[PDB]
Design an enzyme around this catalytic site. Structure first.
Site, short mmCIF file in Angstrom:
data_model
loop_
_atom_site.label_atom_id
_atom_site.label_comp_id
_atom_site.label_asym_id
_atom_site.label_seq_id
_atom_site.Cartn_x
_atom_site.Cartn_y
_atom_site.Cartn_z
N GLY A 142 -0.98 6.78 2.93
CA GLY A 142 -1.85 5.60 1.68
C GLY A 142 -1.53 5.97 -0.13
O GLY A 142 -1.19 7.31 -0.76
N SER A 143 -1.56 4.22 -0.71
CA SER A 143 -0.59 5.02 -2.09
C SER A 143 -1.66 5.59 -2.86
O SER A 143 -1.29 6.25 -4.30
CB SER A 143 -0.82 3.34 -2.53
OG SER A 143 -1.84 3.24 -1.90
N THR A 144 -3.11 5.85 -2.53
CA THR A 144 -3.76 6.92 -3.54
C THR A 144 -2.83 8.53 -3.57
O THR A 144 -2.69 9.31 -4.39
CB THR A 144 -4.68 7.98 -2.42
OG1 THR A 144 -6.25 6.50 -2.48
CG2 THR A 144 -5.42 8.86 -3.29
#
Length: 641
Positions: free
Chosen positions: A384-386
């Protein structure tokens, strides 16, 4: 023109299987009448001898080889064979058996002698069996709290004499079957076993829950058993134990024919270390008990304890926080790699699994589409965008990302050019002027997509090769090495762009995520996770530059402090936090509409005392990993400085 060997070999083969299954009556029936050159005991005596010796030593897996059946005279056939068997003190190999048979009126029987119990036994020789049972080791947490240990369990059983006579007994057994979801046959089979005496207690079931009204004859006794104090909260990490069966034995001949073996998790991973060695001695003695031969002789060895880095309270708080939804949470002390929690939700009851779970409840676990059996913390996911913070750090180090460059971004979608067809990267907030800090605050995928493409695949992979993709972590947990993509090259501007904000073909498990994200708490040094408390800390220096860390971290604090940061809800806790939220959007070929995973990375930037990585799988409406993280954060912040 003879084929009575056919029936001869078969009898010995039927005799052996009868003993293999414990049907001593059946084996006794296949023996010749008692006489000088036939059997040495009546069939009742024979039945009893096997029940007392083979039953006490819990003999299973009796297997023969080299079966030779040669005839000597009309009504007598000789036989011989090699064999091995397993007992409650381990395997017994290289046994040589020999004897004769009597043929008469079509049938063929075994001229029983004591040496078909064990070779070299004769006359009134006896068998002595002594057992020193070894306690299974405990799996304990960093502070000594029990995660797998021995416990007092509620065992339902019946005392046959207290069950009544005729109809009354039938009525009492009916009632027990109702009140405890059991079968009458099950209960009757249990009471019929030979060890049972009129006033003895006969176990039937482990009662997990309140005790219903007890019908006449039924009673509850607290007995020792393997016990899991956190129950489902640590079920996947810890695993469960089950009964030893022949297959286990084939592989390991030292295994006691009766005993417990770990079936998953650490129970399995450390089973040899935890089981120890059962002690005792099986031997042949003369009629007077004078030792004649020693068949097996072991010295007892209690299993050893296995101490983890886990914090039982963090584990429980981590699991409880997932509210029974699909997800994972991993927590560490990033400076040393200690694994404080490894939660996976949903989960299964390890106590029910070890204490005799019905076949229906077991299938309902395996068939649940949310898969409670899987160890989500050891399963690869797109991070994910983390992951934007990783891409960012790589860009700062190589000089392709200037934190002060402001991009103009219009709307929620963007593509490099029309060669992307209908595909466009999507962001959640329409912020017009975006620099690194603003992109981190708002979790802007377009900004990072644009910067990744600008960087190019070569520089991006050069940064990523400094991490741990392809590495097999030194942990007693089964897992696949993280990967960047399926092949060595992306061969696609879109895949490249997507990987930069954490989608594409990245597969990293939550433990691996935590390892990689440790660079922000170690000034660019990666600290490898550890699970065994005595283990030496291991690290990798210079994964990212000090300047990148010093630039990104103050930005991550704003993810929380800024009124527009995606983790601003966490600032109400009033504790020091550096955080990065994320989402992963994955395609669908059944629901059509894609599913979305929600993430939270957080750590204490003032003291680098703890770090957490949490994922809520296929989040619903307004749920998020962030909205569920407050309790765990509060607890880690108070206890890990």
């Amino acid at each position: 023109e003879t084929q009575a060997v056919e029936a001869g070999e078969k009898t010995v083969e039927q005799f052996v299987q009868a003993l293999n299954k414990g049907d001593y009556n059946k084996a006794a029936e296949m023996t010749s009448k008692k006489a000088a050159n036939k059997s040495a005991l009546s069939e009742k005596e024979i039945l009893d001898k096997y029940q007392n010796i083979y039953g006490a030593a819990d003999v299973k897996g009796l297997q023969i080889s080299n079966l030779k059946v040669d005839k000597k005279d009309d009504s007598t056939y000789s036989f011989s064979y090699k064999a091995k068997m397993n007992t409650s003190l381990g395997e017994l190999k290289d046994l040589s058996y020999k004897g004769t048979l009597d043929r008469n009126d079509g049938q063929t029987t075994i001229n029983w002698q004591p040496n078909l119990v064990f070779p070299e036994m004769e006359g009134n020789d006896k068998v002595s069996l002594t057992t020193q049972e070894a306690a299974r080791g405990n799996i304990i947490d960093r502070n000594g709290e029990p995660l797998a240990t021995t416990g007092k369990l509620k065992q339902l059983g019946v005392v046959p004499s207290k069950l009544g006579d005729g109809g009354e007994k039938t009525a009492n057994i009916k009632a027990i079957a109702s009140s405890f979801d059991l079968t009458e046959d099950a209960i009757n089979q249990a009471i019929s076993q030979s060890w049972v005496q009129p006033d003895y207690f006969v176990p039937l079931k482990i009662i997990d829950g309140a005790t219903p009204e007890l019908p006449a004859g039924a009673t509850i006794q607290e007995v020792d058993g393997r016990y899991y104090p956190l129950g489902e909260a640590a079920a996947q990490l810890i695993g469960y134990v089950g009964d030893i069966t022949a297959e286990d034995i084939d592989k390991n001949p030292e295994l006691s024919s009766n005993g417990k073996i770990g079936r998953s998790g650490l129970e399995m991973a450390f089973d040899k270390d935890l089981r120890g060695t059962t002690g005792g001695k099986l031997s042949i003695t003369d009629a007077d008990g004078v030792e004649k031969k020693v068949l097996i002789e072991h010295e007892v060895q209690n299993g050893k304890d296995i101490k983890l880095t886990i914090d039982a309270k963090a584990q429980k708080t981590a699991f409880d926080s997932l509210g029974g939804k699909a997800g994972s949470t991993v927590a560490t002390t990033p400076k040393t790699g200690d694994l404080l929690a490894l939660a996976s939700s949903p989960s299964y009851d390890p106590n029910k699994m070890t204490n005799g779970i019905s076949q229906e409840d077991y299938k309902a676990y395996e068939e649940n589409p949310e898969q409670p059996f899987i160890s989500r913390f050891a399963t690869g996911y797109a991070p994910g965008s983390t992951f934007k913070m990783i891409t960012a750090a790589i860009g700062l180090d190589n000089g392709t990302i200037d934190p002060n460059e402001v991009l103009t971004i219009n709307g929620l979608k963007w593509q490099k050019d029309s060669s992307w067809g209908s595909y466009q990267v999507t962001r959640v907030s329409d912020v017009s002027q975006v620099d690194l800090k603003t992109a981190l605050i708002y979790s802007d995928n377009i900004y990072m997509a644009q910067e990744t493409l600008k960087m190019g695949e070569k520089k991006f992979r050069t940064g990523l090769d400094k991490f741990i993709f392809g590495e097999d972590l030194d942990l007693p947990i089964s897992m696949n090495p993280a990967q960047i993509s399926n092949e060595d090259s992306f061969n696609s501007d879109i895949l490249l762009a997507d990987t930069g904000y954490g989608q594409g073909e990245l597969l990293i498990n939550p433990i691996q995520q935590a390892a990689m994200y440790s660079v922000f708490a170690n000034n660019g040094t990666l600290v490898y996770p550890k699970l065994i408390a005595d283990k030496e800390t291991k690290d990798k220096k210079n994964v990212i530059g000090e300047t990148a860390v010093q630039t990104i971290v103050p930005d991550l604090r704003e993810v929380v402090q800024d009124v527009n940061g995606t983790a601003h809800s966490l600032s109400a806790l009033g504790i020091p936090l550096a955080a990065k939220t994320g989402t992963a959007e994955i395609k669908e070929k059944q629901d059509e509409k894609g599913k979305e995973n929600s993430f939270l990375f957080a750590f204490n930037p003032d003291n680098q005392g703890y770090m957490m990585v949490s994922m809520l799988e296929n989040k619903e409406d307004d749920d998020s990993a962030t909205k569920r993280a407050s309790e765990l954060l509060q607890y880690l912040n108070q206890n890990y400085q």
